[PDB]
Amino acid sequence: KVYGRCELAAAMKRHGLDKYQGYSLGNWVCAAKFESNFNTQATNRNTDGSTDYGILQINSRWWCNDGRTPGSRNLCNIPCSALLSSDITASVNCAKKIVSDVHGMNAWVAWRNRCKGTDVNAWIRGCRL
Ligand code: NA
């Protein structure tokens, strides 16, 4: 599924991400925009043999089990396929484990490059939340 901007914003809000670890809602929306273009089915194979899965492009070397990344960890305790669902629940629950402190969104490269220190409120402006 490809979410609309405001559609995702509302879902993220529902899921309790606003002000999670001090990060306003727009941060999460912006991350998703630049990581996956809001596509729940997005996957990207990395040169280390790991893969990034889903709307937040969560990686198999540490966070999920895809059965094909040798010597990796599974910190969210889920199969990576759970992260490709149309509903964002599994992805949000894993993202909450990833962001364990107030600097935790640095785990996402696209967030650091396109979101951090910008007007992230733009990503929810014009929506009904
Ligand atoms: Na893994």
> What dihedral angle (degrees, nearest 10) is formed by the CA atoms of 37, 63, 113, 23?
90
Q: Which two tokens stand for residue 81?
A: 């396929």
Number of domains in the chain: 1
Instruction: Name the structure determination technique.
Output: X-ray
CA of 57 to the centre of ligand 1 (A): 13
The H helix count followed by the E strand count for the chain is 4, 3
* Resolution of the structure in the document, Å: 1.4
Active site residue 52: yes
Integer-rounded Cα radius of gyration of the chain = 14
Q: Which two tokens stand for residue 108?
A: 């996402």
Residue with tokens 């969560």: 58
Q: Provide the CATH number for the domain around residue 98.
A: 1.10.530.10
Supply the DSSP symbol for 51: E
CA of 12 to the centre of ligand 1 (A): 25
CA of 6 to the centre of ligand 1 (A): 32
Residue with tokens 């899921």: 15
- H helices present in the chain, as ranges: 5-14, 25-36, 89-98, 109-114
Active site residue 35: yes
Instruction: Choose the catalytic residue: 7, 18, 35, 66.
Output: 35
> Which residue range forms the structural domain that includes residue 27?
1-129
Contact status, residue 75 vs residue 104, Cβ threshold 8 Å:
no
Task: Give ∠ CA 27-16-114 in degrees, rounded to 5.
Answer: 10
